[PDB]
Design a protein around this nucleic acid. Structure first.
Length: 122
DNA sequence: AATGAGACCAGATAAGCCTT
DNA sequence: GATAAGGCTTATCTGGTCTC
């Protein structure tokens, strides 16, 4: 009797949580393994008909081996650099309203940008 | 000579990414 | 079974200069 639906639901919920949680301490493997199983157990206890503790361990072992092996601080930077690259690319800075460039005092002084700045070195 | 128009430094900083 | 929403990048900001 394999239980595909609840298994899924547990594997999907927890894996998403684990990707983020591993960064809180980078617990060494033996502790991380216990951590993730324990999160599988907390969701499981929610279901009207929870899976067995053995099944919880299996789904938990899976997430924890994958995530311990693939995740790392350098890892997180790489992701954040890739996203940040997309982000800086389609992002534009607007004029800041309280700046010389924006208030344009030369326009009010009758003269132009370049004359205003030449008259300041003096 | 002294302006303007514009291209230029070079340092700083918001916006935007993902999809929590 | 699948890969990271806060560390990071890019575009443009800025006060100034400088030719033509």
């Amino acid at each position: 009797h394999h239980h595909h639906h609840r298994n899924y639901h547990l594997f999907e919920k927890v894996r998403k949580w684990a990707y983020r949680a591993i960064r809180q301490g980078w617990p060494v493997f033996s502790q991380w393994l216990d951590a993730v199983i324990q999160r599988v157990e907390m969701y499981n206890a929610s279901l009207p008909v929870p899976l067995s503790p053995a099944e919880c361990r299996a789904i938990g072992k899976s997430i924890a081996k994958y995530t311990h092996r693939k995740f790392s601080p350098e890892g997180f930077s790489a992701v954040q650099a890739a996203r940040g690259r997309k982000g800086g690319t389609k992002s534009k800075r607007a004029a800041v309203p309280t700046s010389a460039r924006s208030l344009k005092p030369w326009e009010a002084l009758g003269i132009s940008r370049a004359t205003y700045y030449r008259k300041l070195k003096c």
